[PDB]
């Protein structure tokens, strides 16, 4: 598992790149996969820069923090831009959660450095909502 | 919901105090409530400083980020200090997720300010592992 600030931040950046693609370039594919009829689905970003919409893991408790569950259930009950904004916020939170799970052993100053690197990247919410 | 940096940190601090109490002063009560025989359980911290062991939220998807699911399923299969340490790290992550969920509309300078405040308190993992 990623252990140094450099390893954790490269893992973060890769997952984020996958989720950014899911919510922008591939948004039609992501939207179509989140069918409200299906069982509960979540949006995962992986450090190979792949994104997927999938069931959560069957065995619990999970190794890593898990993304928001059942985002497809909400898709048709709101404006598409608002559904995408909500997915984006929860995906920002998940990415931060994963990084600080790997970073549990970092000291206070290392945690501050890790966040500063993350905070220099625009959030998925800001990109999706058009904030700068 | 909390919106300003101070509002969000007040909420964070109270939820953290709840979770810290569950993992230290109230740990035997907390441990016993995490019954491997029940359905999957999570540990919540609330803004009134109370902690709660319960089933995951009824509403799907949840309004707030949710804590780790099923921690009672792992309680008996590892060292007690290790189970508590992993509950603590997942609980630390959950606190951070909740705060930056509320802080979604903060700008980049405001987000740095919030993290610096959160980073002024020791984490649950550091207290529980005695670091």
């Amino acid at each position: 598992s990623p252990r140094t600030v450099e390893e954790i931040f490269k893992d973060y950046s890769a997952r984020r790149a996958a989720l950014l693609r899911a919510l922008t370039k591939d948004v039609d594919d992501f939207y179509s996969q989140c069918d409200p009829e299906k069982e509960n689905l979540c949006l995962y970003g992986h450090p190979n820069e792949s994104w997927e919409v999938n069931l959560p893991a069957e065995e619990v408790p999970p190794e890593l923090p898990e993304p928001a569950l059942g985002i497809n259930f909400a898709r048709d009950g709101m404006q598409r831009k608002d559904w995408l904004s909500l997915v984006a916020v929860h995906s920002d939170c998940w990415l931060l959660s994963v990084s600080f799970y790997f970073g549990a052993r970092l000291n206070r100053n290392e945690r501050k450095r890790l966040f500063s690197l993350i905070n220099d990247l625009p959030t998925l919410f800001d990109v999706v909502t058009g904030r700068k | 919901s909390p919106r300003t940096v101070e509002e969000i940190f007040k909420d964070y601090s109270a939820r953290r105090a709840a979770l810290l109490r569950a993992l230290t002063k109230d740990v035997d009560d907390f441990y016993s409530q995490c019954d491997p025989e029940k359905e999957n359980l999570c540990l919540y911290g609330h803004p009134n400083e109370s902690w709660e062991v319960n089933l995951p939220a009824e509403e799907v998807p949840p309004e707030l980020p949710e804590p780790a699911l099923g921690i009672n399923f792992a309680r008996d299969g590892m060292q007690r200090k290790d189970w508590l340490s992993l509950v603590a790290v997942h609980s630390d992550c959950w606190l951070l997720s909740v705060s930056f969920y509320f802080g979604a509309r903060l700008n980049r300078n405001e987000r740095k300010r919030l993290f610096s405040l959160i980073n002024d308190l020791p984490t649950l993992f550091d207290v529980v592992t005695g670091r």
């Binding site: 959560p56 065995e59 | 359905e39 099923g70 399923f73 792992a74 590892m78 290790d82 189970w83 992993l86």
Partner: peptide, 12 residues
């Protein structure tokens, strides 16, 4: 390392 000792199937 630090890992959960075991687990259970997600309730449903």
């Amino acid at each position: 390392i630090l890992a959960w000792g075991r687990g259970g199937t997600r309730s449903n």
